Amino acid sequence: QLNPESADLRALAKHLYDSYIKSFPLTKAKARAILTGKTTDKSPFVIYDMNSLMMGEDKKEVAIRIFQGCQFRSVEAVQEITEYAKSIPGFVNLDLNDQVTLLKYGVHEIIYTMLASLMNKDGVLISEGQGFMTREFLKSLRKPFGDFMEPKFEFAVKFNALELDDSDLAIFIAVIILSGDRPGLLNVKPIEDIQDNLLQALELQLKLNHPESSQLFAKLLQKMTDLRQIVTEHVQLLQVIKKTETDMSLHPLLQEIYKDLY
Amino acid sequence: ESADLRALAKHLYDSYIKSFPLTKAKARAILTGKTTDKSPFVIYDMNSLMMGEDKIKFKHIAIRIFQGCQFRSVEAVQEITEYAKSIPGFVNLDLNDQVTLLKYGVHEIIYTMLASLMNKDGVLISEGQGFMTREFLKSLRKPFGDFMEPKFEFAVKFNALELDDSDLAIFIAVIILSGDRPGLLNVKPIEDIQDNLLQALELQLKLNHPESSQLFAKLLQKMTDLRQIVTEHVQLLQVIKKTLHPLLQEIYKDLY
Amino acid sequence: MGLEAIIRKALM
Amino acid sequence: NMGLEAIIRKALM
Ligand SMILES: *c1ccc([N+](=O)[O-])cc1C(=O)Nc1ccncc1
Ligand SMILES: *c1ccc([N+](=O)[O-])cc1C(=O)Nc1ccncc1
């Protein structure tokens, strides 16, 4: 069982982990430490209703501008993911257009993966760990905004119940990136070859790290389907917004909070 | 447990054989000419379509274009449903959840089994009595000539996994027992069954495709592609509203 | 949905 | 292509 093959897989998982640590300053361990109250400098003010919303400020056209905002403030994560992708063995040898294609679909799914780290069943970290926006407060907001985040919380609750750590996620994320079924890929075989190696490394990682979790490997792969669904659901969200017929001054702080989400 | 997983696989296969008259084994035998039956009638151009008109017209019956395939696929829905009843634990779920699982699952399973009737050149129709070529379907006026090509692209890659009916029986069961369907009441017992099906699928693929690296993972990723095709059908219907009519209904009746 | 009615009928 | 594709290409180079 421990042989050159498995040792290569461990070396790959270690390589991915180190590069993930180097690429992503926002790790799951860091998010979990904030959420469980252990980070003195990131004690997130809990925003749970309109009253606390007002106290929180220290610092539809509304919807599209939420999306313009958050999609602009994701540039740093996209650059981090891109840096990480460059460290995946084989990725930079792929056709450049395929690299771009892999990243342009992968980043949204990876952002949601890392968004889950900021989430628990009660809410989501915002403003770099200085705010904690509650799930139920978000859900209570007027249509269409009240429905923005709830399916992400639903995904995150289920994803976090897998108890993956950053060692797991680094490979998981690599597997996401090397998805040979992205539309418009020119050479699918060299991508699938890397992903198969990544999937082998992931499978081993999960055996070594998760003795409790029956079919964790399969359940994790199923989460890639849930991730695609969330991204897909945003397309449908744009349509709901096209034929949205309401005016309401969504509190500007709430618009700012939403720009901190995805 | 290993004998339990093998028994489950065999039970699912036996149910699958009972539930689905046109199997992949039968379809491949027709497609490759290995049967002693008459080779299927072929629709490959306008002449052969008109010549085959009497074989593809309705005798049992803007988005009327798919009412043919809607009706013809009612039988698959029933067969899938009967197959689902044999899945250990399925009929013990709340009936509302059984309905919800099947109502989403059938479309993915129909595409899965449509792939069994497809090769890179075309698809079996009329329960295998006819063969409609991929190029003929591409030849249709836009946007009709784009409807099936995503299906063929999925099918060619899906078929390259070289699954047999034994594999597909478990894979189909795994699809049905998807705990993420909208509106499910009791997710946990669904996942519990699916976990057991996944265990059986894992061992099945290891035993039946020992040299197929990461086939389990690749199969699981195909479920994302299956959902994508179903999702793309929504977009297909929108393209339809923003628009030969009699030909098209019969042409599409055995497709999806 | 008509499909649900067919499925319920097949399940019974 | 989109702005995102342009951000990625820049980051890749
Ligand atoms: C940004 C900010 C908030 C939300 N939301 O709460 O629904 C969404 C976005 C956003 O633009 N998300 C997104 C864009 C593109 N692809 C996937 C998701
Ligand atoms: C029937 C016949 C042809 C096609 N097609 O080529 O796209 C589609 C259908 C059809 O009704 N497919 C379908 C229905 C409901 N959900 C998913 C797919």
Author numbering:
A (entry chain B): 203 to 261, 275 to 477
B (entry chain A): 207 to 267, 278 to 459, 465 to 477
C (entry chain D): 2339 to 2350
D (entry chain C): 2338 to 2350
What does the paper say about this structure?
We obtained crystals for T0070907-bound PPARγ LBD in the presence of NCoR and SMRT ID2 peptides under the same crystallization condition, but each complex crystallized in different space groups and with a different number of molecules in the asymmetric unit, one and two, respectively. We solved the crystal structures of T0070907-bound PPARγ LBD with NCoR ID2 and SMRT ID2 peptides at 1.8 and 2.1 Å, respectively. In the transcriptionally repressive PPARγ conformation bound to the corepressor-selective inverse agonist T0070907 and NCoR or SMRT ID2 peptides (respectively), there are several notable structural changes compared with the active conformation. The corepressor peptide binds to the AF-2 surface through interactions with helix 3 and helix 4/5, but unlike the active conformation the peptide does not contact helix 12. Instead, helix 12 occupies the orthosteric ligand-binding pocket overlapping with the active conformation rosiglitazone orthosteric binding mode, flanked one side by helix 3 and on the other by helix 2b and the β-sheet. This repressive helix 12 conformation occupies part of the space occupied by the N-terminal region of helix 3 in the active conformation, facilitated by a kink in helix 3 resulting in a ~40° pivot of the N-terminus of helix 3 (residues E276–R288) and a ~5 Å displacement away from helix 2b and the β-sheet toward helix 11. The conformational change in helix 3, which moves it toward the active helix 11 conformation, is also associated with a conformational change in helix 11 (25° pivot, 3 Å displacement) away from the pocket relative to the active helix 11 conformation. In total, these conformational changes expand the repressive conformation ligand-binding pocket to a volume of ~3100 Å3, double the ~1600 Å3 volume of the active conformation ligand-binding pocket, enabling helix 12 in the repressive conformation to occupy the orthosteric ligand-binding pocket.
Proliferator-activated receptor gamma (PPARγ), a NR that regulates gene programs that influence cellular metabolism, differentiation, and insulin sensitization, is regulated by endogenous cellular lipids and synthetic ligands, including the thiazolidinedione (TZD) class of antidiabetic drugs. NRs are modular domain proteins containing an N-terminal disordered activation function-1 (AF-1) region, a central DNA-binding domain, and C-terminal ligand-binding domain (LBD) containing the ligand-dependent activation function-2 (AF-2) coregulator binding surface. Agonist binding to the NR orthosteric ligand-binding pocket stabilizes the C-terminal structural element in the LBD, helix 12, in an active conformation that facilitates binding of LXXLL-containing motifs present in transcriptional coactivator proteins. Our data inform a refined model for ligand-induced activation of PPARγ and a potential molecular guide for designing corepressor-selective PPARγ inverse agonists.
